[PDB]
Amino acid sequence: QGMVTKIIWVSNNGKPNLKIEFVSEEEKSNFFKEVKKKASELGLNFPLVQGSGNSLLIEASNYPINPCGCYISPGGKLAINFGKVELSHFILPKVGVKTEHAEIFKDHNTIFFHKHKLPGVNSELTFIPTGTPVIVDYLLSANGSKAIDFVWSNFLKHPYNPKLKQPDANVKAAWEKHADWEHWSNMGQDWSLNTPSGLVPRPNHGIAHTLRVAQLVPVIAEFLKAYSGDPKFQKLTQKEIQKAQYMMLFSVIGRENDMSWTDANHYQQAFKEAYNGQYSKHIYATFKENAQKGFLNHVVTNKSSLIPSLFSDESELQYWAEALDTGKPGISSASGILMALAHDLDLMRCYDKGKFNSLKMKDLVARLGGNEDAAKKLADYAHDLIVATGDRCMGYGVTQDYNYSLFGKCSLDPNECLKQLQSIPKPET
To answer: Residues in domain SidE PDE (predicted)?
Structure first.
């Protein structure tokens, strides 16, 4: 259960109090009943007083007669004494207060709200956003799970488009005139992979890649908080990280082959040189359209589940719908960089060591304040995820080809793939 909507650091009289909002009026009338009863069974006088509307107030402490209540710590943090550790374990889960919100010591009756979570008076902390419906690691959540099932069954389980396996005869002729261009056979590379479990489509951009990059996002975020030195990452909320993680599930669903951006540029120009300068839609533009169509499809179906639980509102959802692109969203924002780094890190599966080190590792190190040790620890984790899913690795660490048996089991079963990814311990900062 949740019960509590939000809590506020208020100041009735000179003493610091805590205003507790609730969903329903009866919910307040039950929180009041259960706690006051629990407090009287511990011989405690817990100052739980009815407030305005559906709110309850925890009055200040009354030393030495009644130490229970609120007070301001010497460090400035808001503290609440529950008298006994028994009462705290009975109240905190009903409110939603965890280690993320306050300092909760083992075998102790007093908690301390973090200074950056609840700085001073009139500071708020929402547990349940107003408008939250009653539905009848974020990858484990209901929203995450439904998104995984969607991108798998609607896009990632399907073969690449044979029409985009190679250009027509005309475009081929215009292509081969450029010696500086890689051959047009790049359009058909990494088409599929034979495994004992079955023929795996798009093996370089499948469910394994998708789940891996999504898995990397919260880990990279923590490293950025610790080693980047940039305030924008230090202020990055868990909510934002969840959205960034959620969006990476749709990162490559639009792809119709394993083309590079450069290959696509070459196709467009060769199309131009072959058909009297006629315009053709850039293939990566088609990819985006495909991904947007899929994303918007899933969104409108589960709009109630996503707003406001994950996305603030319909307009914020519009932002991501427009920003959605293949691989990276190419935005210079905090979230943008985070998602791009997760994408870049997984490129060790298809880049050679020289290419991956120079083009990707040097970037990551710079992002991490120049900390090479931190970068290695992060890259090692990405390497472990690739090994755990039987994928190939050619850009970092102990290089390997596909573990065909393991890769087949994971790539043809998102649930199994997700299970293997979770078997890998996350590195600490």
So the answer is: 154-393
Nearest to 207, CA basis, from 146, 167, 251: 251
Q: Is the dihedral of CA 25, 28, 33, 36 positive or negative?
A: negative
Residue 50: strand pairing partners: 56
Does residue 348 lie in a domain region?
Answer: yes
Nearest Cα neighbor of 407 from 385, 379, 425, 422 is 385
Query: What does this entry list as its resolution, in Å?
Result: 2.3
Task: Provide the domain count of the chain.
Answer: 2
Identify whether residues 159 and 100 lie together within a single domain.
Answer: no
CA angle 131, 135, 139 (to 5 degrees): 100
For the record, the structure tokens of 417 come out as 């793939």
Q: Which of 399, 403, 376 has the alpha carbon at shortest distance from 389?
A: 403
Q: Distance of CA 289 to CAs 122, 206, 321, Å?
A: 45, 19, 10
The answer to whether residues 112 and 175 belong to one domain is: no
Which of 86, 102, 126 is the last residue before a domain boundary? 126
Residue 188 shares a structural domain with residue 323: yes
* Residues 274 and 184: beta-carbon distance below 8 Å: no
Domain extent, residue 351, equals 138-421
Q: Is 75 left (phi over 0), alpha (psi -120 to 50) or beta?
A: alpha
Residues near 262 by beta carbon (within 8 Å), at least 6 away in sequence = 182
The 3-state DSSP class for residue 368 equals: coil
In-domain check, residue 426: no
Contact call for residues 209 and 346 (beta carbons, < 8 A): yes
Q: Which residues of 387-396 are buried (b: 16+ CB within 10 A; e: fewer)?
A: bbbbbbbebb
- Looking at 130-206, list the stretches that DSSP marks H as alpha helix, in order from N- to C-terminal side: 142-151, 169-175
Residues listed for the chain: 429
> For residues 46 and 40, is the Cβ–Cβ distance under 8 A?
no
Instruction: Provide the token pair at 324.
Output: 């959605």
> For the chain, what is the radius of gyration of the CA atoms?
27
